[PDB]
């Protein structure tokens, strides 16, 4: 059905891997912030798909 609490973190840990993850979707400057909203709203309170969930993975960088 949905992903919450520990299940949500396990999912984020598995999908994101070494990259790590975050919970609040970015908003961008001099904007509004429905206050601070993110993955709980998208994947726990409601149903989300893999592509949505993967948007909460942090970058990788790299550096050459």
């Amino acid at each position: 059905e949905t992903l919450c609490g520990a299940e949500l973190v396990d999912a984020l840990q598995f999908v994101c891997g070494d990259r790590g993850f975050y919970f609040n979707k970015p908003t961008g400057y001099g904007s509004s912030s429905a206050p601070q909203t993110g993955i709980v709203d998208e994947c726990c309170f409601r149903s989300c798909d893999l592509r949505r969930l993967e948007m909460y993975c942090a970058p990788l960088k790299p550096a050459k």
Side-chain angles (χ1 to χ4, degrees), residues 2-51 53-63:
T2 74
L3 295 172
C4 298
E7 298 175 303
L8 182 54
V9 177
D10 244 339
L12 281 168
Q13 279 192 150
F14 187 101
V15 167
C16 298
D18 274 15
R19 281 214 275 175
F21 47 87
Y22 59 82
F23 300 83
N24 278 345
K25 205 69 171 291
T27 59
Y29 182 113
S31 168
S32 23
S33 343
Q36 200 70 17
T37 225
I39 187 162
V40 167
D41 312 76
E42 299 173 341
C43 293
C44 178
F45 293 161
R46 51 211 71 209
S47 211
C48 76
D49 68 11
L50 176 73
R51 278 341 150 153
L53 184 308
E54 178 168 43
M55 295 194 322
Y56 291 90
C57 295
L60 28 34
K61 189 64 67 182

